[PDB]
Design an enzyme around this catalytic site. Structure first.
Site, PDB file in Angstrom:
ATOM      1  N   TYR A 126     101.949 -79.643  21.703  1.00  0.00           N
ATOM      2  CA  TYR A 126     102.987 -80.674  21.617  1.00  0.00           C
ATOM      3  C   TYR A 126     102.398 -82.085  21.556  1.00  0.00           C
ATOM      4  O   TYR A 126     101.301 -82.350  22.058  1.00  0.00           O
ATOM      5  CB  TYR A 126     103.945 -80.553  22.798  1.00  0.00           C
ATOM      6  CG  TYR A 126     105.380 -80.947  22.493  1.00  0.00           C
ATOM      7  CD1 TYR A 126     106.232 -80.089  21.770  1.00  0.00           C
ATOM      8  CD2 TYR A 126     105.904 -82.164  22.945  1.00  0.00           C
ATOM      9  CE1 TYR A 126     107.550 -80.429  21.507  1.00  0.00           C
ATOM     10  CE2 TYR A 126     107.222 -82.518  22.682  1.00  0.00           C
ATOM     11  CZ  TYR A 126     108.041 -81.651  21.971  1.00  0.00           C
ATOM     12  OH  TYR A 126     109.339 -82.009  21.703  1.00  0.00           O
TER      13      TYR A 126
ATOM     14  N   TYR B  58     113.210 -82.436  23.223  1.00  0.00           N
ATOM     15  CA  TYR B  58     114.248 -82.661  22.201  1.00  0.00           C
ATOM     16  C   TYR B  58     115.563 -83.205  22.745  1.00  0.00           C
ATOM     17  O   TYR B  58     116.190 -84.024  22.098  1.00  0.00           O
ATOM     18  CB  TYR B  58     114.566 -81.389  21.435  1.00  0.00           C
ATOM     19  CG  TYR B  58     113.445 -80.942  20.552  1.00  0.00           C
ATOM     20  CD1 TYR B  58     113.047 -81.714  19.469  1.00  0.00           C
ATOM     21  CD2 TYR B  58     112.796 -79.725  20.783  1.00  0.00           C
ATOM     22  CE1 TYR B  58     112.018 -81.295  18.637  1.00  0.00           C
ATOM     23  CE2 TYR B  58     111.769 -79.302  19.970  1.00  0.00           C
ATOM     24  CZ  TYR B  58     111.394 -80.079  18.887  1.00  0.00           C
ATOM     25  OH  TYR B  58     110.385 -79.677  18.072  1.00  0.00           O
TER      26      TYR B  58
ATOM     27  N   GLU C 252     105.817 -77.573  15.833  1.00  0.00           N
ATOM     28  CA  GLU C 252     106.589 -76.339  15.765  1.00  0.00           C
ATOM     29  C   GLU C 252     106.146 -75.466  14.581  1.00  0.00           C
ATOM     30  O   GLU C 252     106.210 -74.242  14.650  1.00  0.00           O
ATOM     31  CB  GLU C 252     108.105 -76.591  15.723  1.00  0.00           C
ATOM     32  CG  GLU C 252     108.675 -77.492  16.811  1.00  0.00           C
ATOM     33  CD  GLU C 252     108.656 -76.909  18.235  1.00  0.00           C
ATOM     34  OE1 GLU C 252     108.046 -75.834  18.478  1.00  0.00           O
ATOM     35  OE2 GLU C 252     109.275 -77.546  19.132  1.00  0.00           O
TER      36      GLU C 252
ATOM     37  N   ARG D 229     103.166 -73.719  15.856  1.00  0.00           N
ATOM     38  CA  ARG D 229     103.565 -72.682  16.809  1.00  0.00           C
ATOM     39  C   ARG D 229     104.192 -71.465  16.159  1.00  0.00           C
ATOM     40  O   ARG D 229     104.094 -70.375  16.718  1.00  0.00           O
ATOM     41  CB  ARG D 229     104.575 -73.228  17.809  1.00  0.00           C
ATOM     42  CG  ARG D 229     104.012 -74.135  18.885  1.00  0.00           C
ATOM     43  CD  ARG D 229     105.206 -74.790  19.552  1.00  0.00           C
ATOM     44  NE  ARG D 229     104.869 -75.595  20.705  1.00  0.00           N
ATOM     45  CZ  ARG D 229     105.750 -76.236  21.463  1.00  0.00           C
ATOM     46  NH1 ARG D 229     107.051 -76.177  21.193  1.00  0.00           N
ATOM     47  NH2 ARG D 229     105.316 -76.932  22.518  1.00  0.00           N
TER      48      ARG D 229
END
Ligand SMILES: O=C(O)c1ccc(-c2ccccc2)s1
Length: 259
Positions: free
Chosen positions: A77, A120, A174, A177
């Site tokens: 992240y 988020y 993301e 990931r």
């Protein structure tokens, strides 16, 4: 002197260049990873030496502005970024993480810690837009890069900064990931589209921590209990085993495993 750097530019970006980019990001994220099971596990933050803790993603666009995101290797992240002679960090959750980020961008004149975290829920609040109404694609990324840069000159307002983080985190963290989310981005780039993420992407992102737990706690690949996900049309379904997710999730936060 410096953490590993991966470069990407939206200027003339292709399916191939984005593909190579995400490949390189996963490569640097997994240098210290546990790759001996079904899905790669990022290094445990506990005991991880500080010189192995971060990677840098330097982004550039048609305007040839450049910003550098710092990613935490333990969760892939974004923790902060540099633009010019300033660095900006999300509010750390604990003292160890606050100390960790003092080792980033150590040459900049101006260092700032936002009041807010990079989750988020908060970013959408600051942006005034849910993920489902924020478009992703090469266009949005190009614009996010300029907005991030111009934050440092006073030319970007905070809601636009937050929206821009939402774009960057999804298209980089993301996508690293999840092979699934990388594919969603790849298709956008392929047809020169910009569009918001469908519910499948959003609930994958929401579920990454819980999936990492259910996978690493599993017995013979079988989940202790199901995890609910969504299809692209919003319809729900459950996942009960690790094997079915090998094509979907590329990386996992370290999780402990049961007695
Ligand atoms: O037809 C569809 O939209 C889908 C079928 C399977 C999907 C999916 C989503 C997340 C994780 C694993 C599978 S989406």
């Amino acid at each position: 002197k410096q953490y590993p750097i991966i470069n990407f530019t939206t200027a003339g970006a292709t399916v191939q260049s984005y593909t190579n980019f995400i490949r390189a990001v996963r490569g640097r994220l997994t240098t210290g990873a546990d790759v001996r099971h079904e899905i790669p596990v990022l290094p445990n933050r506990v005991g991880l030496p500080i010189n192995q803790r971060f990677i840098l993603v330097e982004l550039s666009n048609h305007a040839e502005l450049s910003v550098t995101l710092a990613l935490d290797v333990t969760n892939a992240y974004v923790v902060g970024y540099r633009a010019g002679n300033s660095a900006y960090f999300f509010h750390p959750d604990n003292q160890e993480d606050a100390e960790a980020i003092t080792h980033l961008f150590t040459d900049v004149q101006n260092r700032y810690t936002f009041a807010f975290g990079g989750n988020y829920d908060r970013l959408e609040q600051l942006a005034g837009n849910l993920r489902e109404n924020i478009e992703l694609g090469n266009g949005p990324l190009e614009e996010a890069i300029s907005a991030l840069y111009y934050y440092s000159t006073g030319g970007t307002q905070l809601p636009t900064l937050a929206r821009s983080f939402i774009i960057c985190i999804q298209m980089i963290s993301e996508a690293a990931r999840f092979q699934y989310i990388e594919g969603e981005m790849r298709t956008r780039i392929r047809y020169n589209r910009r569009s918001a993420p469908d519910p499948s992407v959003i609930t994958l992102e929401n579920s990454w921590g819980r999936l990492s737990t259910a996978i690493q706690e599993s017995n013979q690949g079988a989940f202790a209990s199901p995890i609910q996900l969504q299809r692209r049309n919003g319809s729900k379904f459950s996942v009960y085993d690790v094997s079915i997710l090998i094509p979907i999730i590329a990386l996992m936060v370290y999780r402990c495993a049961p007695p």
